[PDB]
Coordinates of C-alpha atoms and ligand atoms in Angstrom, one line a residue:
X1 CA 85.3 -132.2 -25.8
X2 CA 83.1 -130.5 -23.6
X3 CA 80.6 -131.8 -22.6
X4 CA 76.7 -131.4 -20.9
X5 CA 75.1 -134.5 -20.4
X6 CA 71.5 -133.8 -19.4
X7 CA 71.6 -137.2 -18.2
X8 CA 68.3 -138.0 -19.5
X9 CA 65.7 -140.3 -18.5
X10 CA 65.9 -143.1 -21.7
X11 CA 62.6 -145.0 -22.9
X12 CA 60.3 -146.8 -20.7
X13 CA 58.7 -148.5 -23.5
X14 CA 61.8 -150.7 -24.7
X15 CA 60.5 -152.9 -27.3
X16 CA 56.5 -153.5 -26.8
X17 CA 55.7 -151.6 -29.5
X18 CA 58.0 -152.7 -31.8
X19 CA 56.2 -155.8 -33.1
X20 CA 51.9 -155.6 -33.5
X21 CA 50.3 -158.6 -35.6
X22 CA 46.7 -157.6 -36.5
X23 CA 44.4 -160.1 -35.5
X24 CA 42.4 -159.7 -39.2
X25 CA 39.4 -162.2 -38.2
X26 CA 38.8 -159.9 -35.3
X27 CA 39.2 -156.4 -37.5
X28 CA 36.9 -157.7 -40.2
X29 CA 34.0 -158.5 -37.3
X30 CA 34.7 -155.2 -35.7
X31 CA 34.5 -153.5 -39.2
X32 CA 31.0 -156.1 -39.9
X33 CA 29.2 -154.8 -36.8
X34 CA 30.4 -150.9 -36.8
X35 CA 28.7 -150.8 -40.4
X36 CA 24.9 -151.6 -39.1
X37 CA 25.5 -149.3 -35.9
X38 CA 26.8 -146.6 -38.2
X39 CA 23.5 -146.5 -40.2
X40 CA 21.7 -146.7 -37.0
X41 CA 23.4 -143.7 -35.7
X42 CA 23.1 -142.0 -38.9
X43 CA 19.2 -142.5 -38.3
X44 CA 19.2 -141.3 -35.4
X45 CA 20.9 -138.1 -36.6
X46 CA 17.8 -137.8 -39.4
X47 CA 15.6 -138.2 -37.1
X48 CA 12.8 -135.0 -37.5
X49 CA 10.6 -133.5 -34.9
X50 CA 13.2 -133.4 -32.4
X51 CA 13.7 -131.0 -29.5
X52 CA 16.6 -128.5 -29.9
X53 CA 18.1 -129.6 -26.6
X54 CA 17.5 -133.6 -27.5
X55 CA 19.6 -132.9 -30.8
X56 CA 22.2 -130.7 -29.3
X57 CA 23.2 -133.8 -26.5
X58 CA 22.6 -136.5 -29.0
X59 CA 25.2 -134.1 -31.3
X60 CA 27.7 -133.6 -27.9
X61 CA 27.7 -137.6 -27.2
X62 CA 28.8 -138.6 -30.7
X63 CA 31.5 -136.1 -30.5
X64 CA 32.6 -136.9 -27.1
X65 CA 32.1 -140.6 -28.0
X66 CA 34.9 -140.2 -31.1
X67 CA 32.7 -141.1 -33.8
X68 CA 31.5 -138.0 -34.9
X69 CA 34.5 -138.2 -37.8
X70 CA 32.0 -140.7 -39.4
X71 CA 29.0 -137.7 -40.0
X72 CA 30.7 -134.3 -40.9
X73 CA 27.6 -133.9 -43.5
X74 CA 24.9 -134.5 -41.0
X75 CA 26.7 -132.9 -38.3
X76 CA 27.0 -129.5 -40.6
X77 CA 23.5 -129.7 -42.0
X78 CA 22.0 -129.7 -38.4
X79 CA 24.1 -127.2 -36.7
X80 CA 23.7 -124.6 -40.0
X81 CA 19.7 -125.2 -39.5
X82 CA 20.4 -123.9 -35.6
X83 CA 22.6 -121.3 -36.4
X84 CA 20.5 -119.8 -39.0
X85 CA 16.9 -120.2 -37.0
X86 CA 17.7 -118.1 -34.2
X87 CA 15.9 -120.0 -31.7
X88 CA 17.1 -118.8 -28.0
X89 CA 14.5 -119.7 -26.1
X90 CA 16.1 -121.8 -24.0
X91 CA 17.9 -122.2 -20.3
X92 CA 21.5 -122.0 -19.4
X93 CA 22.5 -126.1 -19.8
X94 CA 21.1 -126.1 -23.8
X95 CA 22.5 -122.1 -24.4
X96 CA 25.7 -122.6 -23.6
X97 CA 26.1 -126.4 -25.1
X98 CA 24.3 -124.2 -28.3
X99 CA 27.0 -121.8 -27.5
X100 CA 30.0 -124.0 -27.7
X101 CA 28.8 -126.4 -30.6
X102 CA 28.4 -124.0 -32.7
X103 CA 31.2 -121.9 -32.3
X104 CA 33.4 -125.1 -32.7
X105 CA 31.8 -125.4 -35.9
X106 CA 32.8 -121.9 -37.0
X107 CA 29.6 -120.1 -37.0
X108 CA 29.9 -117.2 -35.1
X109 CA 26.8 -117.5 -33.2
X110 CA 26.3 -114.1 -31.3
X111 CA 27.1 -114.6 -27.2
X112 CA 24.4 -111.7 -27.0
X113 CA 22.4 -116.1 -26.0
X114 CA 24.3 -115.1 -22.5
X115 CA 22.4 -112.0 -21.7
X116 CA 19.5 -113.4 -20.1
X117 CA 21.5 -115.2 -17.7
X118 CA 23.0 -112.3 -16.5
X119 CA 22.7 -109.2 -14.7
X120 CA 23.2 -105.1 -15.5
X121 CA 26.7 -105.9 -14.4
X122 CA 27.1 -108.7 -17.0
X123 CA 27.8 -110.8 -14.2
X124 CA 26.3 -114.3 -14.0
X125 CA 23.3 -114.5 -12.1
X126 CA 24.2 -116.1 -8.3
X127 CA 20.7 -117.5 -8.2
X128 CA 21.7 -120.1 -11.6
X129 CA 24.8 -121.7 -9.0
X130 CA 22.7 -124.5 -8.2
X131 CA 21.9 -125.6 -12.0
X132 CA 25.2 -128.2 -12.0
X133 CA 24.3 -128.9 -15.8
X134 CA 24.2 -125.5 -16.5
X135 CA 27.3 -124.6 -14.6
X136 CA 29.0 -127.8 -16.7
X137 CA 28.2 -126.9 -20.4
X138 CA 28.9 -123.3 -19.3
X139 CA 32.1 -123.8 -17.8
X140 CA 33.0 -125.7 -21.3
X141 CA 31.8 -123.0 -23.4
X142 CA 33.8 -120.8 -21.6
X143 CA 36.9 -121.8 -23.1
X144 CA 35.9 -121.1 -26.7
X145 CA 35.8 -117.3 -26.4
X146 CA 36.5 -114.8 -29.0
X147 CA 37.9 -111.2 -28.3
X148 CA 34.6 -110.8 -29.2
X149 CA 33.0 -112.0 -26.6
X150 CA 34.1 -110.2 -23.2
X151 CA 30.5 -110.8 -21.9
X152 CA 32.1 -114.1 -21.6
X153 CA 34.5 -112.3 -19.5
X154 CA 32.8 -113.9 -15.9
X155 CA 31.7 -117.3 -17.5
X156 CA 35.2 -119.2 -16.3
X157 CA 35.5 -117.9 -12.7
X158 CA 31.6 -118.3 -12.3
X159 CA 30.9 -121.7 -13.0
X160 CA 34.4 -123.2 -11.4
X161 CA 33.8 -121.9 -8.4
X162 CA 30.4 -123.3 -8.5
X163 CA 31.2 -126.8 -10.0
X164 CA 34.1 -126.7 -7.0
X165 CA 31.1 -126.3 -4.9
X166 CA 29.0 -128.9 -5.9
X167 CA 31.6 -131.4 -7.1
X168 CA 31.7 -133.7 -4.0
X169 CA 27.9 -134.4 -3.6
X170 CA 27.0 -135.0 -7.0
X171 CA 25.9 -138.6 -7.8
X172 CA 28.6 -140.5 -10.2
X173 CA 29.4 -140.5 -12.8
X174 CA 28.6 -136.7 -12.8
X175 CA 31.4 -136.3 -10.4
X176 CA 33.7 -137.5 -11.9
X177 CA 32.8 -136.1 -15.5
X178 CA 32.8 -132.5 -13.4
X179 CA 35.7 -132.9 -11.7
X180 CA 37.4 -134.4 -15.0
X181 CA 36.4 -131.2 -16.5
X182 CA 37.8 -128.4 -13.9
X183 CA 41.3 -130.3 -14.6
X184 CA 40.5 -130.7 -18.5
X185 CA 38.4 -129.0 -20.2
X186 CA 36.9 -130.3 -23.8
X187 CA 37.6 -127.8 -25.8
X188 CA 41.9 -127.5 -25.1
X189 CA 42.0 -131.3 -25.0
X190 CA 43.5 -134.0 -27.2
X191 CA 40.7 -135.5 -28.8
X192 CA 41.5 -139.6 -28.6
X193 CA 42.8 -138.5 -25.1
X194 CA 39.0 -137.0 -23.7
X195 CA 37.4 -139.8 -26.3
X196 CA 39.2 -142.5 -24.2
X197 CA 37.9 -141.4 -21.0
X198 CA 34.4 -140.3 -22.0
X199 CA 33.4 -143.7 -23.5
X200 CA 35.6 -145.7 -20.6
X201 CA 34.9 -143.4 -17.4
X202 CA 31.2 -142.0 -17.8
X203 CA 29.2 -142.8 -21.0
X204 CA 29.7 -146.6 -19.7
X205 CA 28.5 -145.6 -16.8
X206 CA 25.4 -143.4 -17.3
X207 CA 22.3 -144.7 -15.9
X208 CA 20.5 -143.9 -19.5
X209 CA 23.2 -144.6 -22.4
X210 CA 22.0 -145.1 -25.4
X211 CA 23.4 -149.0 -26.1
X212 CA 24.0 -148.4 -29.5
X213 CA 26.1 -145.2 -29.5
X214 CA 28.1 -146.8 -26.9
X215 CA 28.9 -150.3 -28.6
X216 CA 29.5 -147.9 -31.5
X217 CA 32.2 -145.9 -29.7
X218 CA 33.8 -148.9 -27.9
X219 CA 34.3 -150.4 -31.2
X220 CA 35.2 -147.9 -33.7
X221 CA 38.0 -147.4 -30.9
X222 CA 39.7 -150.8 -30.2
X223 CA 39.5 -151.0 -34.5
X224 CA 41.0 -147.5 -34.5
X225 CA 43.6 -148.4 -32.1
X226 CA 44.4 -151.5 -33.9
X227 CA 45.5 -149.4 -37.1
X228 CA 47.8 -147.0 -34.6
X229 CA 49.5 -149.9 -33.2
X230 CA 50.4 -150.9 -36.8
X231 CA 52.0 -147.4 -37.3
X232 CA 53.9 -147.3 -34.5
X233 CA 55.4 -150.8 -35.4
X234 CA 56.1 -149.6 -38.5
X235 CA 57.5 -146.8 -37.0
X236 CA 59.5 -148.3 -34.4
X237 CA 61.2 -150.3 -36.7
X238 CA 62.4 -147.1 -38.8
X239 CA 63.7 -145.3 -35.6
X240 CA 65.0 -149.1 -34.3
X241 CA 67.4 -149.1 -37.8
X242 CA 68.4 -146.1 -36.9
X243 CA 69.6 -146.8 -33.6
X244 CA 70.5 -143.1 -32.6
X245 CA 70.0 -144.8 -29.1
X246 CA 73.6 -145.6 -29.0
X247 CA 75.2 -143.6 -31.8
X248 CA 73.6 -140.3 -30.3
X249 CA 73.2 -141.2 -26.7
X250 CA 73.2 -137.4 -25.8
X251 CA 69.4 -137.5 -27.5
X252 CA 66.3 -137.6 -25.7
X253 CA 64.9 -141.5 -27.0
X254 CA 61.0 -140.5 -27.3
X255 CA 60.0 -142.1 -30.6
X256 CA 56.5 -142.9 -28.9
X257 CA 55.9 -139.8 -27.4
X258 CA 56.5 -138.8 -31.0
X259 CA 54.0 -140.7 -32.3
X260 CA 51.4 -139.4 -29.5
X261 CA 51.8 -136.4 -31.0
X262 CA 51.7 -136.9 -34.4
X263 CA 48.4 -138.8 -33.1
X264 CA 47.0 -135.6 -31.6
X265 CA 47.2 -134.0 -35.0
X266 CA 45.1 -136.8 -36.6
X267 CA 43.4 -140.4 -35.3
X268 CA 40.9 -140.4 -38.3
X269 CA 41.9 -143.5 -40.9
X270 CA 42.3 -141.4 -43.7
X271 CA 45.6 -139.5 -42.4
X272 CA 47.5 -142.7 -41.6
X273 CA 50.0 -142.1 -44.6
X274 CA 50.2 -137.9 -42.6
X275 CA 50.8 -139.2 -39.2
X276 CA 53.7 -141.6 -40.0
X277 CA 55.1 -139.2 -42.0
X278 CA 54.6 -136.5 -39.3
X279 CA 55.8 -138.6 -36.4
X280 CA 59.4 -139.2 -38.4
X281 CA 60.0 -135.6 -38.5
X282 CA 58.8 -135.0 -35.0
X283 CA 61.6 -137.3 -33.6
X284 CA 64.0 -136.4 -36.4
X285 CA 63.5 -132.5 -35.4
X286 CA 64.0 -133.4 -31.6
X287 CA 67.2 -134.8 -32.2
X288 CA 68.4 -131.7 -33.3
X289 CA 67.5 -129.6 -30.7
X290 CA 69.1 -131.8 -28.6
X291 CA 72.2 -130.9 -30.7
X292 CA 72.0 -127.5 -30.7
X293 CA 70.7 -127.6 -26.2
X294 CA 73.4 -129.6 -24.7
X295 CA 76.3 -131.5 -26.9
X296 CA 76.7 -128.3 -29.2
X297 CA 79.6 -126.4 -29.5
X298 CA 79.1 -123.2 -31.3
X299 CA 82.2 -124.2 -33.5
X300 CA 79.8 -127.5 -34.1
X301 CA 76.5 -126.0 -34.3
X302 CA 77.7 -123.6 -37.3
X303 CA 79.0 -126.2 -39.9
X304 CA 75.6 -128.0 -39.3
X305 CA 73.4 -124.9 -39.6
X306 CA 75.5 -124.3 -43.0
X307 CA 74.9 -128.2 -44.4
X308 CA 71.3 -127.6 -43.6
X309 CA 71.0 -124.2 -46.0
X310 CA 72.8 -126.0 -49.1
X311 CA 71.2 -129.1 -48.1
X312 CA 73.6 -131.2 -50.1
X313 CA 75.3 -135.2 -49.2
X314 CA 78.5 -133.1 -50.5
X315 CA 78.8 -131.2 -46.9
X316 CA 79.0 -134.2 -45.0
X317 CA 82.3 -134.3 -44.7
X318 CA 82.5 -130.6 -43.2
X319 CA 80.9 -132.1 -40.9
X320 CA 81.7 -133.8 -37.0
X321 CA 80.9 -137.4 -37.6
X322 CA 78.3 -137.8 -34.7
X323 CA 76.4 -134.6 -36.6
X324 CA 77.2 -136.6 -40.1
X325 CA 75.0 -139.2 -38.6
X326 CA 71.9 -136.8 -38.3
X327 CA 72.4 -135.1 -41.7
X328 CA 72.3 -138.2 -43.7
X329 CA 68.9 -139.4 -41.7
X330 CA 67.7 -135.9 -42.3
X331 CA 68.4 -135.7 -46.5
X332 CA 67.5 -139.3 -46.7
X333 CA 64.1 -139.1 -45.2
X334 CA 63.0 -136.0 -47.3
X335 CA 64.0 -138.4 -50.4
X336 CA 61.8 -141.0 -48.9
X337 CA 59.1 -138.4 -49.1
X338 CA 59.6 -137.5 -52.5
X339 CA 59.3 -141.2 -53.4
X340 CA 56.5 -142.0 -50.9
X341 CA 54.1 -139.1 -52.7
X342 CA 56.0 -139.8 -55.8
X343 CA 52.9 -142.0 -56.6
X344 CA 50.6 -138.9 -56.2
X345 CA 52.4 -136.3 -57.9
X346 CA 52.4 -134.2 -55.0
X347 CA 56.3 -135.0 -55.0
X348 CA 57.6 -131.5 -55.2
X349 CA 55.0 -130.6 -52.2
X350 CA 58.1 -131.7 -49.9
X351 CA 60.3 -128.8 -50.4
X352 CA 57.6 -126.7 -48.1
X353 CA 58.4 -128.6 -45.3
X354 CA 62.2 -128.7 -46.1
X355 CA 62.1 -124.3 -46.3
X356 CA 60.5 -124.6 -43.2
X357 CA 63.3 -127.0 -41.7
X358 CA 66.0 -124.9 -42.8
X359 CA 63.8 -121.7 -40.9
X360 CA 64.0 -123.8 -37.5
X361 CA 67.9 -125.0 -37.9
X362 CA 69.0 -121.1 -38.3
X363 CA 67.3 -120.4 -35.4
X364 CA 68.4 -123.1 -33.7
X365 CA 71.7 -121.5 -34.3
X366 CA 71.2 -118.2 -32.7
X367 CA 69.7 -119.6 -29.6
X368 CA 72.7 -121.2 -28.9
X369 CA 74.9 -118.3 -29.9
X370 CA 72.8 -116.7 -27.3
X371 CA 73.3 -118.9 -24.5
X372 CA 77.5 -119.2 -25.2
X373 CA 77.3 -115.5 -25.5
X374 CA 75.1 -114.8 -21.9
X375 CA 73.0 -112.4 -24.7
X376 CA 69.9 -111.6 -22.8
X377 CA 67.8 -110.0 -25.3
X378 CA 64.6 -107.9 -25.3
X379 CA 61.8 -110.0 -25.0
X380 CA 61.2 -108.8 -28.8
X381 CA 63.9 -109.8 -30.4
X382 CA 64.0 -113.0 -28.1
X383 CA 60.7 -114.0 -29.7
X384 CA 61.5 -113.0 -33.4
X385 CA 63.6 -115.9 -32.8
X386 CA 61.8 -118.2 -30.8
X387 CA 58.6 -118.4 -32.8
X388 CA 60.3 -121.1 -34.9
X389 CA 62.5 -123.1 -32.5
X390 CA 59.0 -124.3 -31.2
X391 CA 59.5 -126.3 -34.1
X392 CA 55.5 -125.7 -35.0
X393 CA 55.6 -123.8 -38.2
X394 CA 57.3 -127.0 -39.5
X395 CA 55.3 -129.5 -37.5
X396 CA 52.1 -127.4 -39.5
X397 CA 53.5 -127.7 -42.4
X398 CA 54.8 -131.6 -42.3
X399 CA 51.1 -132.6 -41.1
X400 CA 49.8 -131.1 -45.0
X401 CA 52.6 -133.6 -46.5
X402 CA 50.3 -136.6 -46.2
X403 CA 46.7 -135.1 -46.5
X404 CA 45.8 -136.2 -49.9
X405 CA 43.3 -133.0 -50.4
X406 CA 46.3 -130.6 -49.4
X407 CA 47.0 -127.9 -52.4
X408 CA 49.7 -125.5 -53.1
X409 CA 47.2 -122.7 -52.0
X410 CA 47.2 -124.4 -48.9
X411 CA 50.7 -123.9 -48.0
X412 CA 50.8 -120.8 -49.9
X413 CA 48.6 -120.1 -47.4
X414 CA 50.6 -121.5 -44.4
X415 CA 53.5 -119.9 -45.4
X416 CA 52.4 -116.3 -44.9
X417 CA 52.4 -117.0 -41.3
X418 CA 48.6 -117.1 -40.7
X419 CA 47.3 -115.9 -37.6
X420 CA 45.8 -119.3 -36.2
X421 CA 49.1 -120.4 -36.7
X422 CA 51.1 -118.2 -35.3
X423 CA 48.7 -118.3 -32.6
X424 CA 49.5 -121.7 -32.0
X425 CA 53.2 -121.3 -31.7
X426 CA 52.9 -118.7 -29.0
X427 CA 50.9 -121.2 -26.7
X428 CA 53.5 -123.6 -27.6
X429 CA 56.5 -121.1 -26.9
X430 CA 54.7 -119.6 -23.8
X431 CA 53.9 -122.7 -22.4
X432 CA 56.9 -124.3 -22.7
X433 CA 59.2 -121.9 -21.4
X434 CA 57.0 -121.8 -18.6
X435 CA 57.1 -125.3 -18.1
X436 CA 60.6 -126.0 -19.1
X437 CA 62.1 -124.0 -16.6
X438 CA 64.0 -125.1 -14.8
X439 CA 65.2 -127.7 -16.8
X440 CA 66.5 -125.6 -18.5
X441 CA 67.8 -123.9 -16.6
X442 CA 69.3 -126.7 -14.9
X443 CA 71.7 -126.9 -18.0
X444 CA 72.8 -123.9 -16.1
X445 CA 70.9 -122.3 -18.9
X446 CA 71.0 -118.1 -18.8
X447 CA 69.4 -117.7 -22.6
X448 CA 65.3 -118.2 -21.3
X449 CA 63.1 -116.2 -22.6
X450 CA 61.8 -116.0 -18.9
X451 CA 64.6 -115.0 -18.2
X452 CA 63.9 -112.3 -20.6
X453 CA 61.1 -111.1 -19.6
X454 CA 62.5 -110.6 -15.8
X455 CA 65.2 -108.4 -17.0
X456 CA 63.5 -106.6 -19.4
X457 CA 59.9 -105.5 -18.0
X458 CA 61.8 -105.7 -14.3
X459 CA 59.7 -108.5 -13.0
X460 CA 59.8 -111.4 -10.5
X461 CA 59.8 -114.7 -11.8
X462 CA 56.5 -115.8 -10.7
X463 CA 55.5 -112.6 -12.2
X464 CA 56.5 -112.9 -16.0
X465 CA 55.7 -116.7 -15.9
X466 CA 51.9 -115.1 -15.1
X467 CA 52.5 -112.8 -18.3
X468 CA 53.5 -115.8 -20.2
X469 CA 50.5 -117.6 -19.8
X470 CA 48.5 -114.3 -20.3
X471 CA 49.8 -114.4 -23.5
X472 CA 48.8 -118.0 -23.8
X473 CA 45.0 -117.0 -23.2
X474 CA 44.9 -114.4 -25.7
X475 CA 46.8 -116.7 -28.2
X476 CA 43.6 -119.0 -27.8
X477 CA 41.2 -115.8 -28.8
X478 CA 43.0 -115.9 -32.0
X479 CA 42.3 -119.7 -32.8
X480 CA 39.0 -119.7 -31.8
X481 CA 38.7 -116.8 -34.2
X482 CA 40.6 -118.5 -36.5
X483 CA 38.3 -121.0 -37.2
X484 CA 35.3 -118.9 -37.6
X485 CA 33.5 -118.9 -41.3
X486 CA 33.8 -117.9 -43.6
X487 CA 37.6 -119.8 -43.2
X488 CA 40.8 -119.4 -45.6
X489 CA 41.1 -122.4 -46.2
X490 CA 39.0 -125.8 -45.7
X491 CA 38.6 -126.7 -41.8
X492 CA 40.5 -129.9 -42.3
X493 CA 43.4 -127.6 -43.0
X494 CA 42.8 -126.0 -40.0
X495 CA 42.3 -128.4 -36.7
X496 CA 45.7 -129.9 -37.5
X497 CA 47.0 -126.4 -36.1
X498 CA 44.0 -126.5 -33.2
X499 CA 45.3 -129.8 -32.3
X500 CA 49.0 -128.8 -31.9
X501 CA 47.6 -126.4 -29.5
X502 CA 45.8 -128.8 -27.9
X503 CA 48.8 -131.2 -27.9
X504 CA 50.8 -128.4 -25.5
X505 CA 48.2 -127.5 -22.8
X506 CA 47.7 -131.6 -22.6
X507 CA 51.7 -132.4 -22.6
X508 CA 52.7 -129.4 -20.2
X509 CA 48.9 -129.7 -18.1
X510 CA 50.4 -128.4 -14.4
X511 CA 52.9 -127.1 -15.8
X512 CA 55.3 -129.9 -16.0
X513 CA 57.6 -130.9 -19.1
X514 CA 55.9 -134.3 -20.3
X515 CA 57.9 -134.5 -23.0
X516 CA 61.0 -134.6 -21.4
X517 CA 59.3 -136.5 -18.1
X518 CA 57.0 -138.7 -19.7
X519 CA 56.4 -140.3 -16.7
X520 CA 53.5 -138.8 -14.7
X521 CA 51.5 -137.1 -17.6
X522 CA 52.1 -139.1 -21.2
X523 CA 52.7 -142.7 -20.4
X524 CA 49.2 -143.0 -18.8
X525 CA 47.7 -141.2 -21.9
X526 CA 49.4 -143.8 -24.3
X527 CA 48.7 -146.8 -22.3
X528 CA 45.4 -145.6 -22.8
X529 CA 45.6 -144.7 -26.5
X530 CA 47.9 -147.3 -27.8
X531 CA 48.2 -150.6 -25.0
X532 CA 45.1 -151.2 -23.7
X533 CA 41.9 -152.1 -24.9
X534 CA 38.3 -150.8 -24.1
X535 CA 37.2 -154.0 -22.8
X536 CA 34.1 -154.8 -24.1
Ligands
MG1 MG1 65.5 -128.0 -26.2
MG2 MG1 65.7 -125.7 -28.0
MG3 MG1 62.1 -125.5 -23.3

């Protein structure tokens, strides 16, 4: 009866995704070749009498290259040898590649390595702005500081400057991996994203690849990207039957972007079953909060919120009949769940994600209360409740669903709000309301937590957006730390929550909503991901 119309931009992908037959002879040659390249890789990894600074780049190239997934073991064994040698004797390139591998690892290699680059000041040494390669791996290791590590404090601003500097005389592809880096750097990126252009944009290009590492790379991707294709068949077809394209036109229609997500979370084979389970409620949640932002009546918005908390097919009928749409979708695909792990046993595992549901929709509730209302509230209170509406506790929780290893002292531990996590649903908050406004307001919105912030610290609008992604950097401490050993639970539990961080500094990169305007930022990374090809 009211009502908004945020006249949304619809797909841009219409049906090319819908249909993908696997071309099997070409997947089993793929698969034929990748095995003898493997074991030559694995070789190469074994290899003994190497230099420290030969093993850390051959370690950095399998990683960049994507294919690292394929030697955790070797990987580990070799960077625990480093860590516990205590070696530094080395320059700034190998120290600070040293630096970053290891602390991506989780051992919490000391960043006293960083003195002797320094002066009395702890201020980079001027006279090391002309080592580009050191200035590079710095730069990079930069971004994986601790709160420990304020003698990091310099490393960002230092090397920028420097690589700005240099940048435009360097020889390719250098350039371009430098330049590529001041706009993105490793650590904060989406892994199949940085993979794609690594293998594609400078590893192709180097004057002295290693052939074998890059036939590797080229390969394992195009197979890789031939099972993601499948998925998102699959999973076009699911959202296709459910046509919420014309019976809730008011949506955002951004299934694919959905499944770039869920993508971001995981690419590795083994968490195919996790990602297409995580993509349906990524798309399923974003239809609500396009219920409860625009088309949502606070009469409206109540009954739902209510259905949701008894969770029951008897409440339907309390229920508008657009929003009875939703509700069946919702209960029906948590009964696929139970049936889909049924299998495993790990059927009653499902009702940690629905808890977690029910913990978003409530707040969905009082966010809209708070817009109908005009309720500015203190930045506090406006984040007590906007902690969950970033929808992350649940997407954390949803990505376990599907990882076979997951145990209930997994999300025993998740649900005790751990501090990587929480971590990660500031950046996402932070980010987005940063990014997201105006869009929002352009609703005619008034309930921002930007908003917030202005009236409550009396601050300019440029000025709390800077406090915002303050709080963004300090957010990143905490995961950095968070992933530090000895860990609460296994690392595979953990870089699911890394990579939904990663997933909003990539989505919202110049501070732009991708999600909502996939336009400029996502469609190139999922033409790249999911349409075409490395060619070989
Ligand atoms: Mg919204
Ligand atoms: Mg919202
Ligand atoms: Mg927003």
């Amino acid at each position: 009866i009211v009502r908004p119309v945020a006249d949304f931009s619809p797909s841009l992908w219409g049906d090319q995704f819908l249909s993908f037959s696997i071309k099997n002879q070409v997947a089993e040659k793929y698969a034929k070749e990748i095995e003898a390249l493997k074991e030559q890789t694995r070789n190469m990894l074994l290899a003994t009498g190497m230099k420290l600074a030969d093993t850390l780049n051959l370690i950095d190239t399998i990683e960049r290259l994507g294919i690292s997934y394929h030697f955790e073991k070797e990987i580990d064994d070799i960077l625990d040898q480093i860590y516990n040698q205590n070696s530094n004797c080395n320059d700034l390139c190998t120290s600070a590649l040293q630096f970053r591998l290891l602390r991506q690892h989780g051992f919490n290699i000391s960043p006293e390595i960083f003195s002797k680059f320094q002066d009395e000041n702890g201020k980079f040494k001027e006279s090391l702005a002309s080592d580009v390669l050191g200035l590079l791996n710095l730069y990079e290791a930069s971004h994986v500081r601790t709160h420990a590590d304020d003698i990091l404090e310099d490393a960002l601003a230092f090397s920028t400057i420097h690589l700005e500097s240099a940048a435009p005389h360097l020889k390719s592809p250098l350039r371009e991996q430098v330049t590529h880096a001041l706009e993105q750097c490793l650590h904060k990126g989406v892994p199949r994203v940085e993979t794609r252009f690594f293998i594609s944009s400078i590893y192709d290009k180097e004057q002295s690849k290693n052939n074998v590492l890059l036939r590797f790379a080229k390969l394992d991707f195009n197979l890789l990207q031939m099972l993601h294709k499948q998925e998102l068949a699959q999973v076009s077809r699911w959202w296709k039957d459910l046509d919420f394209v014309t019976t809730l036109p008011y949506a955002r229609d951004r299934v694919v972007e959905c499944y770039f997500w869920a993508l971001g979370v995981y690419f590795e084979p083994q968490y195919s079953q996790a990602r297409v389970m995580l993509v349906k409620t990524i798309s399923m949640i974003s239809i609500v909060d396009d219920t409860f932002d625009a088309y949502g009546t606070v009469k409206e918005l109540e009954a739902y919120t209510d259905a949701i908390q008894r969770w029951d097919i008897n409440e339907i009928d309390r229920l508008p009949d657009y929003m009875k749409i939703s509700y069946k979708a919702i209960l029906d695909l948590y009964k696929d769940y139970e049936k889909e792990l049924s299998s495993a046993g790990r059927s009653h595992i499902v009702c940690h994600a629905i808890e977690r549901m029910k913990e978003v929709v409530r707040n969905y509730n009082v966010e809209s209360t708070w817009f109908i209302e005009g309720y500015t509230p203190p930045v506090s209170e406006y984040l007590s409740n906007a902690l969950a509406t970033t929808t992350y506790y649940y997407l954390a929780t949803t990505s376990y669903l599907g990882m076979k290893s997951a145990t209930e002292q997994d999300f025993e531990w998740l649900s005790k709000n751990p501090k990587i996590l929480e971590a990660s649903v500031i950046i996402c908050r932070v980010i987005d309301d940063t990014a997201t406004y105006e869009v929002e307001k352009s609703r005619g919105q008034i309930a921002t937590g930007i908003e917030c912030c202005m009236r409550d610290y009396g601050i300019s609008t440029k000025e709390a957006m800077a406090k915002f992604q303050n709080m963004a950097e300090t957010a990143w401490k905490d995961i950095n730390e968070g992933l530090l050993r000895p860990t609460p639970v296994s690392t595979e539990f953990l870089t699911p929550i890394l990579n939904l961080a990663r997933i909003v500094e990539v989505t919202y990169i110049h501070n732009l909503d991708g999600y909502t305007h996939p336009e400029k930022v996502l469609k190139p990374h999922i033409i790249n991901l999911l349409v075409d090809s490395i060619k070989i």
